[PDB]
């Protein structure tokens, strides 16, 4: 999970990074500066995680490509208003014990932290309304 400048001055132990909302991992840290768009950074991360799925279990094999396609829409500015709430649901349902191994829980850990700390750049992607259906002549639709 991503951490902020406020999360420095904090020791590099397993339970100290654990109480800060993240995991200590390999202990090799990566710095993100002010010129990297967070949505593009997460989209690069999820693209790696989606394509490195072994394909055994459904919420990794099929859940993660949906997250990638939403982030590509957010990065280009084609995001729809239900998209961010889908990313939240994906993170909840790809947690520990719901998938077959720990690959998928590790994949959603950057995604859920970046929405929590940087929601404004994710909200900036939403510039188009919701439409996943096309009109059919002679059939009046069900108007919500």
């Amino acid at each position: 999970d991503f951490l902020t400048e406020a999360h420095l001055d904090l020791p590099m132990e397993f339970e100290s990074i654990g109480k800060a909302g993240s995991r200590l991992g390999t202990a090799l840290a990566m710095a993100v500066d002010h010129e990297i768009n967070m949505v593009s950074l997460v989209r690069n991360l999820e693209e790696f995680f989606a394509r490195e799925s072994c394909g055994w279990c459904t919420p990794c094999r099929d859940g993660l490509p949906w997250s990638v396609k939403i982030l590509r829409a957010l990065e280009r500015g084609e995001g729809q208003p239900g998209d961010i709430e889908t990313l939240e649901q994906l993170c909840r349902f790809l947690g520990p014990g719901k998938t077959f191994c720990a690959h998928a829980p590790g994949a959603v850990e950057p995604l859920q932290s970046a929405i929590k700390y940087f929601r404004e750049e994710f909200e900036a992607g939403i510039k188009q309304p919701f439409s996943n259906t096309h009109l059919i002549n002679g059939i009046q639709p069900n108007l919500l």
Partner: protein
């Protein structure tokens, strides 16, 4: 000059309204029941020698939707029928087209005459099959 005895009963005689020993036509409408079938068989017997019978509606042509223990599957099982008018209920215009289809039989005589072999399924076929466009149903 055709005298009609209408035995329409329920939900098929309401269209007819919108549209003994004296009649030559018996327009059976409505559902024919096992219990009331002798009544229609005696009324058919009472009439004179040149009888004509028009069945209108699915409940009189066949059993219709009532393929059930208490309904006979068509009035043609026990009385001869001349014209069949599908629908549930048929239209008054259909009743008019039945009398027009029946005067042709009254003027064509064993009244088949090798001319009644032509059927409205084959006669209006080139009319119906050449239809391409129909009005969209989202409008009145």
């Amino acid at each position: 000059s055709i005298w009609p005895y209408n035995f329409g009963l329920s939900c098929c005689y309401v269209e007819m309204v919108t549209s003994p020993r004296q009649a030559d036509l018996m327009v059976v409408a409505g559902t024919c029941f096992t219990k009331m079938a002798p009544v229609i068989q005696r009324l058919y017997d009472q009439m004179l020698e040149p009888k004509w019978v028009i069945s209108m509606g699915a409940c009189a042509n066949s059993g219709g939707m009532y393929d059930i223990y208490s309904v006979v599957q068509g009035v043609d099982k026990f009385i001869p029928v001349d014209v069949y008018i599908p629908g549930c209920p048929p239209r008054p215009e259909a009743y008019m087209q039945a009398l027009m289809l029946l005067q042709e039989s009254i003027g064509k005589e064993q009244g088949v005459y090798r001319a009644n072999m032509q059927s409205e399924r084959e006669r209006k076929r080139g009319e119906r099959i050449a239809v391409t466009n129909l009005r969209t149903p989202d409008e009145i």
